[model samples]
Each structure stands twice: as structure tokens, then as C-alpha cells.
Target chain A: VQLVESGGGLVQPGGSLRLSCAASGFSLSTSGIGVTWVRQAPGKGLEWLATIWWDDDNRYADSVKGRFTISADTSKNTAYLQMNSLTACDTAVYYCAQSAISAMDHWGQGTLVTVSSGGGGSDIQMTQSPSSLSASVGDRVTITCRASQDISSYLNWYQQKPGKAPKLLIYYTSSLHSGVPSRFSGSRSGTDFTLTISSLQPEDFATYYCQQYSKFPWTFGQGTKVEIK
Target chain B: VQLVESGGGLVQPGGSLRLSCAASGFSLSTSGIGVTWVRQAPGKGLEWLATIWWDDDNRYADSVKGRFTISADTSKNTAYLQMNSLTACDTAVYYCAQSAISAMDHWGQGTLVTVSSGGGGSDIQMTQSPSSLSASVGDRVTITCRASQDISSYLNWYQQKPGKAPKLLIYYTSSLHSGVPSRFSGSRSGTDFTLTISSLQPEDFATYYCQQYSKFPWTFGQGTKVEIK
Candidate 1:
């Protein structure tokens, strides 16, 4: 009989999570075939995440490039996923299984990890209001972010979309990143910040976040969802 | 660039078509990963057939057991398919490819095979009339078989189903083998014979055939199709 055990943990935004899989009763691989890692969101189905082969070669989902590492230490019969620059979207329950077509058969129980928008410091919290809003396709959509203290113009805005990498929308509260459209803009007054779409484009219907870099421990807003009316 | 050329031909019932795959510019197996053979009937999609590994180890579909073999000659960089005891259901286009997760890539050209309802004999042809029939569930469905000569009650009947080996339904014209349900019965009136399903079950929707072994060169009837309305 083949059995596997895995582990995971919660991490703050911009943090990292190292998920692991441990096996007993059998060697993880016999023919250079290694372990596969799959993830399932809280309410979604399983999705293939990455694979670490016996030769230590790696294969990962396109969405995991530059931020995910699949590895294993055979001496301990353990496989691990070292992921960095985590965001709220990275929250999921991960599973470790064999690397074959019926790879889902003999799999580890569960490794649930939640990536919240919480900062490293408890005092400097970032609050994003309206949780979500509905707007017409071309309407201007503005979301507000409030900081518990005066972080001034050090806050940044980012757009997170499904099937795409987290992209920076603005830096220092108001400066748009290179190649980003002008319709997107950001501003701040005292402890209150705002991300406003001058004219929301079809692709602007996504989630937005605000983060502060001036503080000792970087902090991020919970998130604001923009949806098509 | 790697090159793999495949080939196939026509085969009559019970006859064999040794399908082949020839390659150049690349080796057949690396690290025991072998070649895979797939079948796609006229309008259907690909169905995995068999595999011949580097060690000459063979893996086959359950339906091909005892009636089919997959072999390869690495010295010539070629693979072979020895398929016998075939019926009309065996007709399809075959392909040879490398084995891996996305195994469909790096495949050879098509090897089209047509298994006709023919026999080794030319005279004393076996004829199953009413090419196809539609009947309701639980109906008594019967099909007729006519022989050019008075073959007496020495013929046999078989049921050919998709993805399964052909099954012997009636022997010596009228006897049911052990384990077969009594709903199936056969009889002969001189050269005219019939295979009847006393009460058709849901799974009985299939093709039927009759064969005469009493003569030197055995003859087989064109299949009669039974289907649901």
C-alpha cells in the first residue's frame, strides 16, 4: 500500500509558504518518476500546480513561473513547494500525489494554506472598503483604502486577475507603471487612499489591492472586487 | 528532426493485419519509454490500443487480450501490431506515438485498416440479412443468417461489441454456453438459421454474426446490427 502525508500553513501578503509531502510504506519513486502537487481553492475543484521529478527536474503551471519551486529531499522522503511573493489569490488547499495520468489515485490528505491581506505588524492595518462593487462596462470605478496611520504617498495599488500574474498598477500612490493605460489612476489624502479608473475598460473588471511600504512591516488592504454590472 | 512512418492494410474476419511503424532520425525507446498505438474509427476520436516498451514488455487494452499483440524491432527502429480474430468493429485508422503524459504528440502518419465482413472461403458465402434493425427494450429481437449451401445446424453465432472481445453467443447453431443467459437461443431450418434474443436487455444492443465451420474454408456472415429505438 502507498501512503503520503503533506503539510501547509497560513502566510501574509508578500510572504512565502513552504508546503511539504512526506511518504511511508513505499519509496516515493522507483523509476525516476517523482511527486506532483495539486491545489484546490476553498470552493473550486483541483488544479494541477507543479511537479518535481526524480532527476530533480521541475515542471510547473504557467501561472507559477518565477514564484513557485517544486523540490524533494529523498533522504527524508519529503517533497516541498517553496512559493514566494504570496498574495490573497494564492490561498488554497494543496495535495501531493504521484506523477502519472491517474496521478490523483494515491495522494496526500490535505495541506490547506490561506494567504490573507494582513500585514506583519498588527498596529499598521490597511482597510479597503466596499469589499466589491458593480459598474457598467465604461463607467468610472473608484475604490477607497484607509490606513490606520499616516503612511503618506508610500502606498501602492495592484490589480489581480484570474489566469494572469499579479500586476502593479500604480507606485507612490499616484504614479502609473510603465506601459499601463492612463485611464487607471491613484491618489491619497492623509490616511485615506483611492484607486480610480477614469473610464473602466472591459479588462478592468478585476480585484484591486493597496499596500504601504513606508511602515516597518509592509501592509496590504483586504481587496476590492470590480465586476461588470 | 525525428521521423516516424506508420502503415496498415485491409483484413478479413479472423485474418490478421500486421500494422507497422517505421522510424528514422531518432531511437524508439529512451529510458524504457516505448511507442503507443491508438485507434480512431471513421468518425470517432482516439482510443488507446496498446504499448510496446523498450524491454519489449507489452501493455494492452483489456479488450485486446489473447487476440492482439504489440511488438517492436528496435534494430530496424520499427514497431508492429499483430491483430487477429478481427471483425467489422476492428476497422479504424491506427497511429504510433511516443509514450509520456502528453503522449499524443510525435505520432506517425495514419495506418488505415478496414476489417470487412468477409471470410477465407469464396463459395458457400454466409449472409446475415436485414443489415440493421431497431427494437424496443424487452422486445424479442431476432436476426436471420442464410448460407449458400445446406450447412445444416453446424454454424456458430457471436456478438461483437465496442471495446470488448467478440463473445460466443450460440454454439453448434443452438446451444448456449455456460454463464450465458437463456434469453439467447438459436435454431436452423436447413440453410436458413436465426439467432434470437427472447427478451432483449439494455446491454444487448450490438452486432451479431454467423459462421460456418463445417466446410474446409470457414465462411462468415455480414454482421446484423441490433439497436435501440
Candidate 2:
């Protein structure tokens, strides 16, 4: 049995990330051996992340109490670590170890992760009235977006469904993305933009968001939900 | 962009288990798409598990507030659910869905899990004093164990490392498991049992436990650690 660790990659701009350690040849939940999770960033010395003891007790380091979670699934022979509202500072190679009576004797190679934040500069806020809507198929629907400042033709509209990457419906304020149905159209006025569904189709029930990349720190609306009434 | 779910398998007799859902294509964190977990037992209809929304808000069913966790990692486009101190009632098919604005539109083929409990009869409390030890390579170490009542020769000893499944060293009192080093041996006197390491080897720095299998509800000792002093 050996320690194998993988997966804890993250995208920045604040989000939750979960890492996993698959342990075999031992009982993490039943044995009196504890699971110790440690981290090291570049040349930064090792930092104690958290540990789950043989007594079913869990302990997190000072700065990780509220944001980090140390857990395991003995049935599946796996351990997990989850962090919330993450920052770039958490980027590092995390090592999983079997805490014997004294120091750690067994260690999983390591799972390294990085924080990729795509936002910078002043963040322009965007608003969408009526976060959701109730309309039926073949009905006309209109969703509007307002930017904190004038963005001219720098607005875009996207339709997010369950399976597909968000589909771009309208771009540059008024031009529809290729392959979009003619029933969908966009219009603009100063800092305000509107995405109008001339006639909603059965496949149009999804969340629609308006984005403004007019400057640094691109901004997106809270999104309007399209519900079949 | 399809949703695929698996892994929540659990061992019975109660423990923590984490289930995972692999979501690809669409962004689970950025696309405003929430992960809604639902469970259905044998003819038990449907039970709302937990939901992590696209807006960074999470809500759990009344019964799952403290013992259940709903989390996700956007970089891997996966969602996680962890339950602690599980019960047989939790054995069922768990469904993963992309929570649209109103109802769930896309679903991953359900992952079914069973609770296999192997315990019955009276529970015997087990304890180990000085749970840990300080020793070094080639040094002799002895760990003792005691059962609540006379367990005869039904006792066993195991060595648990970080990667391998707990390796059986001695069984039926003093009989060594096949291939085990001769340095390890077990001896019993009434309800008291002792496992002695004649000459500690480097690989012998692992936790050792004594288990009794003479009754319906098998029992085990609290385990003793062999440290390299």
C-alpha cells in the first residue's frame, strides 16, 4: 500500500477548491494512525495544513481553521482537503502523510496547485433587474443590463445551459454570435444593454448573463434566469 | 459539457464518505450553474440532499445541516459531497444535476451506494494505554492488548502503513500470517494479549492493533504505535 495524491488545481478570483489523496494498504478511518496534510510553496518552508487523528479528531492550523477542511473516506480509502474563498498565497505542493506515533513516516509524493486569477484593476459593477424570469416557449422576453459607466459596444451576452460551455448569443452590443437563432438580438444605449428574445424557443431555458470587458477587471451582470412559465 | 458522477462507495459500521461528480465543458463555478444533489432510497421517493448555487451561495436540506457538506472545485469542474457517521438509511442512489434557475435540467447517471454493516451483538469498549511509542531501528518493542472478556485464541495483530492495506502479522493468538517476519510474534494470557517485536526493522515502524473475532460482533484494540526512538 502506498500514498498517491492528485487533483487540487484551482482558478483564481476567489472560489472553492478540493484536493484528494488516495491511500491504500492502510485504514485511515479505523487505524490509530492519523492523516497529516502539509504544504510547501516554492522555497517557502513547509506549513502545517491540517490533520485528522486516529481518534477521529481533526485539527487545522491557525490560519486555516475556518477556510480549510480535512476529511477522509475510509470505505473508499481516500482523503480530501477543501479550501474556500481561496487566495494565490495557498498555491503550493501539498503532501499527505501517515502520522505515526511521532513524526510522519509515510508520505504521498505531493499534489501541487496554483491560483490563476484573471481579474485586475478597478472592477466595474453590472446589474440585472429581476434576477430571473417566467416565460413560456414561443414567447417574447427582454432582459436588460446596466454598467456602472458608459461601455459603448463593449457588451456581450451569453446563454449558459447544463451541458454546454456558455453559448455566446450577442457580442459587441448588437451583433449575434454565429449560429444563434434569429429570435435572439442585442441592443445598446450608452451604459445600458438589452438582450431581447423575439420569440423564446424550447431550448432557450437557461441563465443569461451580460458582460462588459470595456476595461481592466472585466465585469459581469448577476445574470437573469429564463424559466418556462 | 455533460455531467458524470461516481464514487461515494462506503464501508459499513459507520464512517465518513465523500462522493464526487465530474462535470466537464461548462463551468460549474463561473457559469452560474449550481450543483444539486438528490438521493433516493429503496422506494423512499426522493430526498433533497444539498445545493451549491452558481452565485456562491449554498443551502442544505434541514436534516443535513451539520453532518453533510456540499462543496465543489471549479478548476477541475467537479462537485463533492461528504457525510460523516453515516447510517444504512443513507444507502441509495445519488443523482447529480445541473441546477438551472427553476428546476434541474441535466442529470448525471446516478451513483448507487450500499451500506454494508458487519457488526452485530454487544459492543466491547477497547483501549490502549500510552497509545504511542518512541523507539528506533533494530530495537525491540512490545505492545499489549486486552479484551473485555476471555477471547481465547481468537486474537490477531496487524501492521498498518501509509499505503498498504493493514497487513496481518499474527492471527489466532500467536500464529504469524504467511510471509510475516519472524521477529514479530503474538502471545496471549486470558483476555490480555501482547504483540512483541523481537528486533524492530525499518519497515516495522507502523501502528499495531489486536483484534478479537470470537463473537458475532468482532472487536479490536485501540492500537499502539511503534516509534523509532
Model 2 alpha-carbon miss at residue B86, Å: 27
Over A14-118, each residue of candidate 2 has an lDDT whose tens digit, in order, gives 466788878788777666777877776654434556778767787665435445789888777888888764545567777787754433435677767766544
| Candidate chain B TM-scores, in order | 0.50, 0.50
- What tens digits encode model 2's per-residue C-alpha lDDT throughout B1-229? 6788778774552456788888877778775688877675654434556778777787665344445688888778899888764545567777777764433435676777766544344445445545889888878788888877666687767676643434567878888766888998888767577889898888888777666656423445666777776
Please, what are the lDDT tens digits per residue for candidate 1 over residues B113-138?
A: 87664445455678888888998898
Question: Can you list the residue pairs that collide in candidate 1?
Answer: none
TM-score of structure candidate 2:
0.31
Error of 2 at A6 (Å): 33
Interface RMSD of each: 25.5, 18.0
* Clash counts for all predictions: 0, 12
> What C-alpha lDDT, on a 0 to 100 scale, does residue A111 get in candidate 2?
69
Runs off by more than 4 Å, candidate 2: A1-121, B1-229
Candidate 1 residue-wise lDDT at A35: 79
lDDT of the candidates, in the order given: 0.69, 0.70
